[PDB]
Every structure is written in C-alpha cells, then in structure tokens.
Design a protein around this ligand. Structure first.
Ligand SMILES: [Zn+2]
Ligand SMILES: [Zn+2]
Ligand SMILES: [Zn+2]
Ligand SMILES: [Zn+2]
Lengths: 291, 291
C-alpha cells in the first residue's frame, strides 16, 4: 500500500531525487555521553520515543545536472539484512535507469553507503565511475590498519572491510573506482573534508543558480537528539570527538548561510535546512512537499 | 516525474491515507494583526519565505477501519482552479477505488473541502453518504443569511453557496447528505465542535488501540506563523476571535495529551503531533516516513 520511496526536489535547472534504502530502529544507548533520561526527554518532544528504537532513515540521492546523472551514496544492498537495499528499486520507480548513472560519489565507505553500488557481486551501475576520498580508501583498504586499532574494534573493521571489497571489486575490475584529494572538483561538485565519523568522511557541495545544496553524509544520525544537543556523539563515529567538532562547524555554517541540506540519515526525503536561534541548538526544517 | 501525493500511515489495525489536493501560495498579509516583519522573521526560520508566497498544502484523508472506508474532506475539485483537485487522482494512485468509499466526513463546507465529493454535479463516490454538522449546513444553506454578513463579504458567501450546492446536490438526491449534532458519532468517529473558522466547523477523532487521531480540519493554516504565534488569526476565518480561541484550546490539549494530528492545511501528508515547551508557543512535529 505504501508510496514508493522517491521524491523529486528541484533546484533551478537541477533535479535531485531522494531515494529511500530502508529504515532502522537503533538503540537510544548509541547516543554517547548524554544521560539516557535526557535522550528520552528529547525523543518525547519529537514524538519519537518508541520502544522499538530510534527511527532512522537511510537515504541516497540522485542528481540530474543535465548532461550527467550523479548518485550520492547508494544504500546498503544486502550488506545489513533484508530490511534495507531499496535504493535501486526506488531509482527505477522514480523513472530513472541504472545505466544513466555516470558518476557515484561516496561520502564514506560504511556499508550502508557503498554496498548499494553492487548486488550479487555485480555492478548495479554499469556506466558509472565511483569516487571516494583518498583518506577514506586508505583507512579501509590497508592490510596494516587492522593491527593499528584496539582489539575490541578489530572484528568489526575486518567485517566491514570485506563488504567494502565485495562492492567495489566490480568497479575496480573496470578501472572505474577512483579516489580524490581535497581541492578536487568532480562533475561540478566540490569536495569538503568532514572527517571524524570515518577518517576520510567527505561531504559534497553543489552550487546552482541561487541555491547551494550540501550532501552532508553522516555528520549526523538524527533530527532529534543531535539537533537539540549537537554536541552528542554516536557510537558509529570512529573518532567521536572529531565528529562532534565537524558537526558543530558545519551546522553553524548551515544555520548562518542557509544551504539546502541532503542527508542520508535524516527523515526521508532527508532534504531540508537548519535553523538556529542561538548557535547552541539547531532545528531541522524539512522541505515542504511540492507537487 | 514527481512522486504521487498519497502516503500510508498505520495506526494499529487502521490505515490512514493522506491525499494531496494541491498546493497554494498565499500572500503573507493573510495572517492578521501581526506585524508583517514578524511574519517574515518566522517564515525565514522555517525557510518558507519565498517570493511567490506562503506555501500551503491542501490535503484530504482516507481512513480504513476494516469494515468501512471513510473519506475526511475531499479537496477542491475544480472550484478554485486547476492547480488544485488532485485528491481523486491520488486516491486512485494509492490503490483504492472511489466505489469503496462508504462514508464522507466534512470538517466544513469551504470549497477546498466539499467540492471534491462531486465532479460537475455527479457523485465521485457513488456508494457514499456525506455527513456535516447541522450548524455548518444551516449557515451555508439558509438563503437569508447572505444579508447578515458585512456587505463586502456577501458576494463571496453567495459565490461559495453555489459551489457547495452543486457539489452536494447528487448526494441529497439519494438521501445521502446527512447532518449531525454534538454528541453524535459516525462510524465510531467522535465529533468535536471547533467553530470559528466557519460557524459549524467540526473536527473528528478516532480512538484506535493505543492511539488517538484527530482530524482537525481548518483550525490552522500553517506550521510556521500559527505554531510559533498561535494567537495569529487568518483572513479566511469567518469569526477570527472565535477561531483563535478554538485553536488555542485544541493545541493545548494536543500538546498535553499527544494526539496524532491529521490536518488539511499542514505540509503534506499533514500528519504529526504538537509539542510545546511553555504552553505559550507550539511546534509542529511531522511524522517520520515509514516504509
Ligand atoms: Zn556511516
Ligand atoms: Zn550511514
Ligand atoms: Zn476552510
Ligand atoms: Zn480549507
């Protein structure tokens, strides 16, 4: 019965399509260094205090800039179980075709962003080249990195390394998996270092006529706790301190300058703006549905 | 290109289908007796201050209670021009068929709520009987009253009376235009008097297992100005003071008791909850998309 998970946002001559991969329900305990009672207070304000968990969208974004169609993150495919992986189905439902995707930009290599580039070990996007930051690929694809982290963290790392390798293998085989450095522009997108969540996490800025859109990646995981209390890290952050520093910097910029935001973990479609009354707390303003 | 304007909200064993009729952009002077500078400040906070006007959804709601399919308001059909009138198309897009509708509940007889029940004098919902408050019918259907409104308001009244009559005629002819009074229930929906916007404006509440849902009608026309400043009347209200008094009462209830809200003029799908930090200002918390 439910509507398909795509939404079309128009930015002048550019169409951005929000694509839903699925919905998670995470433990409120994943929010770090904040009393759980205050977490529950914030969730109750936003009518989001469900015993099932903290509802969290996983989104990806298609950007039609006229001559090119670029995909920004791709969802999880099958890497995290049956409830995710809807990105490709919604791309097709939206009217686009996977063969039309020319470029894929990855904010980082966590499986819920990279795995969607492939399915059953073959590329979903046969004409696309995949980009991710130099720093990000270095961290996940160095066979020496595993000894450089505490034993508690080694199993998880190795496990996601395998999922990463399987997704990108079909693109490496075609010489279509690329890395970039700061200062690099790709398809008119500007790359912005927003490290912390992962060592090479980047966001991507698209400037169009009269509107800037930032595809922020995982500098935030909630429209609730981390907006009222932006200093709140989450357990998914590899460097929580650095990730907090990064969010506070970017949210300040967004509140002041009013960029349109596209986020993989804000409520689908995940497109909106951030307001702040005082520079201390922020409020997520979703865009208003436009038929 | 754009996704169809229907959305499924599940409440226990009840399915609520939000249906988009279209989108209006009203001038900011429609908000009464509030400095336009403050209106503009608030619009800016919610990134809603665009040159063409204040974006305002027009929605209707299907409620599937298992044994009955009920439609709550119906959009504007052709009564206001061609940017509106999508409800029937979106109903069909959602998978339902108009023959399945057995009950139509009207919050009030404004054209953007009643005209959708028919298309040029033929019933869109052949199996449905329509209910509206007796106070409301009395106000619009007593061919004297036109003379008791201020002279500058009479022409509009006569104008909308004729649209109302055109739309309800084919239901009256089948003995299927009924009125009710306070204390009556219809298909297990409770009626709530919320007069002011129109003299017989009513809201409808459904108690499901674990959740109460109020279909509030036109006690509000914005998620912005009239939440941050809930005392702000709108030029569309027939009795602004009363309409303000009604909104204030209901929003205090909603903030306290946490009812789920379904509104025809909040941003589509128009479903969410009301929060307040101080009993003075309110915040619209939209629901989080669930695949
Ligand atoms: Zn991540
Ligand atoms: Zn993620
Ligand atoms: Zn009205
Ligand atoms: Zn209305």
């Amino acid at each position: 019965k439910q509507v398909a998970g795509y939404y079309q946002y128009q930015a002048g001559d550019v169409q951005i399509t929000a694509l839903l991969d699925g919905t998670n329900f995470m433990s409120p305990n994943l929010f770090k260094d904040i009393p759980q009672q205050q977490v529950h207070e914030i969730l109750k304000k936003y009518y989001a205090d469900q015993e099932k968990g903290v509802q969290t969208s996983i989104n990806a974004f298609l950007v039609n800039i006229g001559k090119s169609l670029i995909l920004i993150d791709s969802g999880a495919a099958s890497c995290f179980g049956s409830h995710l992986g809807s990105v490709l189905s919604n791309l097709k439902a939206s009217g686009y075709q996977p063969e039309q995707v020319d470029t894929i930009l990855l904010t980082h290599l966590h499986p819920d962003h990279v795995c969607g580039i492939s399915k059953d070990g073959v590329a979903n996007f046969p004409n696309a080249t995949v980009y991710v930051s130099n720093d990000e690929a270095s961290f996940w694809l160095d066979p020496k990195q595993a000894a450089k982290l505490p034993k508690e963290k080694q199993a998880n790392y190795l496990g996601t390394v395998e999922k990463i390798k399987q997704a990108i293998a079909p693109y490496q085989a075609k010489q279509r998996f690329k890395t970039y450095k700061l200062g690099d522009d790709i398809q008119g997108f500007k790359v912005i270092n927003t490290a912390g969540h992962t060592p090479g996490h980047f966001s991507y800025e698209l400037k169009t006529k009269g509107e800037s859109i930032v595809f922020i990646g995982d500098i935030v995981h909630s429209h609730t706790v981390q907006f009222d209390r932006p200093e709140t890290a989450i357990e998914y952050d590899i460097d929580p301190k650095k990730a907090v520093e990064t969010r506070l910097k970017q949210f300040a910029n967004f509140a002041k300058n009013g960029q349109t935001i596209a986020a993989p973990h804000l409520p689908f479609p995940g497109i909106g703006h951030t307001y702040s009354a005082d520079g201390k707390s922020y409020q997520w303003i979703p865009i208003h549905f436009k038929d």
